[PDB]
Amino acid sequence: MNLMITLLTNFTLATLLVTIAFWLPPFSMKFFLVAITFLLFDLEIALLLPLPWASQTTNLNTMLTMALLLIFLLAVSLAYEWTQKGLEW
Amino acid sequence: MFMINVLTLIIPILLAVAFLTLVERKVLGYMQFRKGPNVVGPYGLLQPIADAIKLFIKEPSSISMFILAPILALTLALTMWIPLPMPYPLINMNLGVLFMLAMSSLAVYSILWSGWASNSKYALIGALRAVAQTISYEVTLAIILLSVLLMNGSFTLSTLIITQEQVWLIFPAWPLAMMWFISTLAETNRAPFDLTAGPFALFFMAEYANIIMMNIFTTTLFLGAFHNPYMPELYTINFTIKSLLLSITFLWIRASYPRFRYDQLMHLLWKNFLPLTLALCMWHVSLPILLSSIPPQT
Amino acid sequence: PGIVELPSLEDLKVQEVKVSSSVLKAAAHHYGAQCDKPNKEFMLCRWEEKDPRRCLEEGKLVNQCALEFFRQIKRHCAEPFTEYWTCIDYSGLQLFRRCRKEQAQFDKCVLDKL
Amino acid sequence: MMTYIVFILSIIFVMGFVGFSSKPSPIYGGLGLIVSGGVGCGIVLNFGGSFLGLMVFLIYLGGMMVVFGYTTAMATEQYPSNKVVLGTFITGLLMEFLMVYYVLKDKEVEIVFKFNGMGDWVIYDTGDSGFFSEEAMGIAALYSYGTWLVIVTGWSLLIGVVVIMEITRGN
Amino acid sequence: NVWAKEPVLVASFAIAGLAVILPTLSPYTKYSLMINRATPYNYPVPLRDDGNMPDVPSHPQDPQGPSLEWLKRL
Amino acid sequence: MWFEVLPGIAVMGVCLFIPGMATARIHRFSNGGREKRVAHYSYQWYLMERDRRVSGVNRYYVSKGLENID
Amino acid sequence: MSLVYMNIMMAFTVSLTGLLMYRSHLMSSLLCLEGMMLSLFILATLMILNSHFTLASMMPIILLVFAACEAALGLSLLVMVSNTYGTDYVQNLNLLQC
Amino acid sequence: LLQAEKDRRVLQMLRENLEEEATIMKDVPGWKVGESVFHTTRWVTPMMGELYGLRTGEEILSSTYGFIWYT
Amino acid sequence: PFFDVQKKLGVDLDHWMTIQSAEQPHRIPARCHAFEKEWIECAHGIGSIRAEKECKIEFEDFRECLLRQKTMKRLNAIKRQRDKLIKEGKYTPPPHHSG
Amino acid sequence: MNPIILIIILMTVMLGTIIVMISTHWLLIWIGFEMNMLAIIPIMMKKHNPRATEASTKYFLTQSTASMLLMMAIIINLMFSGQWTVMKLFNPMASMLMTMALAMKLGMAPFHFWVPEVTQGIPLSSGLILLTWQKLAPMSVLYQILPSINLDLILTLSILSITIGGWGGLNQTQLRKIMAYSSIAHMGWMTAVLLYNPTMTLLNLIIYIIMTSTMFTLFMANSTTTTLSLSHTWNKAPIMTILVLITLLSMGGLPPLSGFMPKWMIIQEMTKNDSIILPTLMAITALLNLYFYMRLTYSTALTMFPSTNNMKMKWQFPTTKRMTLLPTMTVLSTMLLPLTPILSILE
């Protein structure tokens, strides 16, 4: 409710500013690769990111190996589109 | 005293942004051979207060969506200084760095809403390109954030200010710091990373509050000072001075270099940063498991 | 179908060691050192038979052992333990690197007199 | 300003879901789903919730509706709304408000269940000593245990990349 | 040569290759695993004492049990 | 030269300086010179709840040290 | 019974009907499918929170990344549809008859 | 010691809440006075409603919702 | 086809994602841990039909553990009786703060 | 469309189906259905006509809503008695929506509206791989969670599916829609005998996939879509026609030929249960869906249509394709009559 009070105060101040302002007077296919490419790398980011919360376990070799396989798989995908004229124009 | 905490947070943002505008105008003028503004007003503070009240005066989409874009940009600019650990942070959030990143993504939302709101023009197609060059850097910035907190246990950021006070984090990773700096250049959307309409003052306000947010977060992340307790004023003065110097350096780089080509921008990003980011991040994974120093999350 | 039986306040009228947790954290190693040998009776009782309303008299036992330890630290050495917890009190969440000098003085106290 | 705050946030969550499931123009639908995801993330953080709901918020309201607005903007314009959307929204509000009445001032309404009528501050854990904030270590699995799962997930992501580029004219 | 053709990529391959290989030789792998294993998160329960095992002291000050000392010995 | 701009830069820095100092003063005022007990976990929260329980005021800050034994 | 689950299931059913009945554009139906995805996410997440099923908490994040790449394939198909026609209509599909 | 105090306190709340139920339901049909819902007589962890019922807002919001949106 | 790679090649890739009583990373239970262990040991060497004939006691115990359906039913009956007799208006309550 | 990339995608089809087979966890089964969808989409649109675009769009929407309804059923299952085993479930509602999702998956008369559409405007290799693998996928699921299903669901699906495949099918002119309607009818058959003995279901799956492989291999041997080109392939090649004769009559399921054996054994272990009018009504429908088979065989091999020349010009040139394995699979698919106690292969 602390964040709710801050959100309320900032929203009401924003509405006061906007009411003071306004009450006192064809595409490319090559565009489409960027968004889905971004989103799939953001998905692999979502796979990578629980690592620093995890790094205190006993099975550390398994953690290190699957972390290597995750970054290496992201590298394989990036090198795939790199060699196969993906992010070109 | 919670609403008074809210007042002490969100009252000085207006004076901070307007004085940042006079500072960047004067420092651009001294990077050039231009004294001024110093005629009307002592050292030109009346000049930004007259800029604000004048741009409020000089005023003549789908009125719903036309309001929904800058209201989102301005409420993000307001609500995103909360977990900042100027010595005692406002809300001790358990995790705030991904909160920073998600609200940067909401800023990208507000930019896309205004881009649709610019009423069916080659202007809006250029605005979609601006959305593309804005969104093309939250991958790299998040992965660099993951590496630089990988030596820091968890997102809690007070444990970060514990880890920073021995030695600065610039020495464990200076090129990763420079790459994150370039990513902040690309995300703050000024020179050399350009470009592209009302209310101009409120959008102006939102972008500069975004830049101050990133500046304070940058000065937080990669440096610090010895924090003597029961006197926060020492760390507050020293952190404020170094945030001033970092923001001056950021405008100082905004001044003097030509812009990029769009395909040069994308080609540069992917095929120069992104394998280098991956190699630095797998090295940041493989390092503490081999040096027997993993950070103790509580 | 099955009703239960719950014990009365006949055994739940017991005074507690109602100090703050900051000074109790300041007395962590020492209270774990001399006392807290027969509280593992209560711990073993609870982790074997998972019943509260079973091992409560050993709860009285650990309560009076903590009361014994607190009277012993109150009467005997020393007074600047008060200084020690009011030193470590306002440090947000407590660490042990925070108030080290008075910790060393309290060490010298407890080593020289007990 | 009362106790049933999870219930009221669930009500506004269903309000937003109706507000875009009445089939508007799709960018207004994306606006409604952004508001719905915001209040749903508020729901899961109000169960606490301190880790996971804000964690995957970057992927859903950090990754999805941006790309939806992207592919909606570069597809067409839909410059004309219709009475059918307003009628469906009124019928959805009718169903919502009728469930509100027959739950709040009554006992239960059962599709095939028995919904006990009260705001659920209970059930809830009895302050048990986690000290590691169970969500944290929970999602911080997959690295001492999760061998197979990350392998097949990265396999599907790699195949998703090559599938997208092939269908969008590989190479 | 092969270097300045695509230089940042070759540099990335070099630093990534040493990041792969460097776990195969290190004087701190087993030290890392022992330091990580030697941190009690879960609470140690006691038990019914033993049938006279050559371990498990009564007071934990008594060094009869298997304990750590290299935490202080660098 | 820069002699004319550094007072304005200093005023902008004071506007950057002021919310941390004001917030820290309200922090130290809100607990009688003490800091807020920064509870992050369930264990810290139960510790803080027994702290506000044993103080009698239903307010954690008093902390009633060692004078409750006999 | 945790009364919030009733309205989240009602929200699921509303999102399901918004998936199935749709008149003008495929983007609306696919967005209702994304909202249904969000519904299943939130429902299973609150189950795992209030149940303290702490061991296999993989479900919400893995559900969302997989159905995310599903949605990415759907956007690829919609872009292909908008390319090989002028629009993205529910109509203009009577060819390849039944 | 915190474990022991917690167990004594929740048993005290259970004894007081059985006193509450012995006061209030003196006229209802059915209702054995101390029904556990289950079958096997083992100790079950309470659900915070048996610990804090009929409190009306204050202490339940402090003991449940305080950690969720405080600090 | 239920192939026996899981029981043949020995790699228990999914014999830990399944239910609890497996070793958590920090060893904690959930709300119904003993009920899980008892129900599973009731239905181990059982062909799933006399599980329904015989283990119904522990099955219903486990379900009322997992939902607290009749528990919240009884609690709401308590609340409705409290509401109607405080509408009646008797004994300004010393369950709270007093006696 | 590099052959390395297509071998990769075939490997993903295999991997998704095997994850559907072996995983005892529900999430991985959902992941397998998704990955098989994601792999089978670029198999289609091997060309770039809008026909394959619309076909893959329709199939994407159907498979997507099937996957989402399955995830719904799993989440409801853990709202009730919650365990991640593929076992006898504990909800009529969850098993109800789960069988409805599998009916979306493999096609039933409620859910068959996409099948002739998606099978018309695609190449035949894509139709082969989608029919074989997407009907092999739910059989493991039903084979493992049979003991907690209300039988009226699957029974109504089966009756209505076989009679829709009987009625729809007597009017069409495309071979792809003919094979699609036959797939509808036989999947109704192979789902109908679930809750009594899954041995018949799995063995009928074996026989039907062998039949469809032989049929689509024959239609790979001549790039034909209508009966007209089938008569032209009569006028250029005779042995293809006797193959069409024998294989189509085995799809008819006639007792000297091997296709009657999955019918007859189903009738046996369905009528050792003392319901009789339902199996004989289903067998009347199995009589009913033989007419289009028979008129197809008439227009191919037994009647002779006139033809246009340049097939004289074709006569100098061989039918020089390579087949995957046509003749071995054909004589396995047709001469398999005395191998009735090979039913015992399963347990």
Residue numbers in the entry:
A (entry chain D3): 1 to 25, 50 to 113
B (entry chain D1): 1 to 60, 66 to 201, 217 to 318
C (entry chain A8): 1 to 114
D (entry chain D6): 1 to 80, 85 to 175
E (entry chain A3): 10 to 83
F (entry chain A1): 1 to 70
G (entry chain 4L): 1 to 98
H (entry chain AM): 73 to 143
What did the publication describing this PDB structure actually write?
The ETC is composed of four large membrane protein complexes: (1) a H+-pumping NADH-coenzyme Q (CoQ; ubiquinone) oxidoreductase (complex [C]I), (2) a succinate-CoQ oxidoreductase (CII), (3) an obligatorily dimeric H+-pumping CoQH2 (reduced CoQ; ubiquinol)-cytochrome c (cyt c) oxidoreductase (CIII2; cytochrome bc1 complex), and (4) a H+-pumping cyt c oxidase (CIV) responsible for O2 reduction. CI is an ∼1 MDa membrane protein complex with 45 protein subunits arranged into two “arms”: a peripheral arm that extends into the mitochondrial matrix and a membrane arm that is embedded in the IMM (Hirst, 2013, Sazanov, 2015). In mammalian heart mitochondria, the majority of CI is found in association with CIII2 and CIV (SC I+III2+IV; respirasome) or in association with CIII2 alone (SC I+III2).
These differed mainly in the relative angles between the CI peripheral arm and membrane arm and in the angle between CI and CIII2. In all other classes of SC I+III2, these loops were disordered, suggesting that they are distinct forms of the open state (or deactive form) of CI (Blaza et al., 2018, Fiedorczuk et al., 2016). Whereas in the closed state, ND6 TMH3 was a clear α-helix (residues Leu52–Met74), in each of the open states, the helix was interrupted by a π-bulge midway across the membrane (residues Tyr60–Met65). The ordered ND3 TMH1-TMH2 loop in the closed state crosses directly above ND6 TMH3. Surprisingly, the CIII2 MT-CYB that is in close contact with CI showed lower overall resolution in the SC class containing closed CI than in those with open CI.
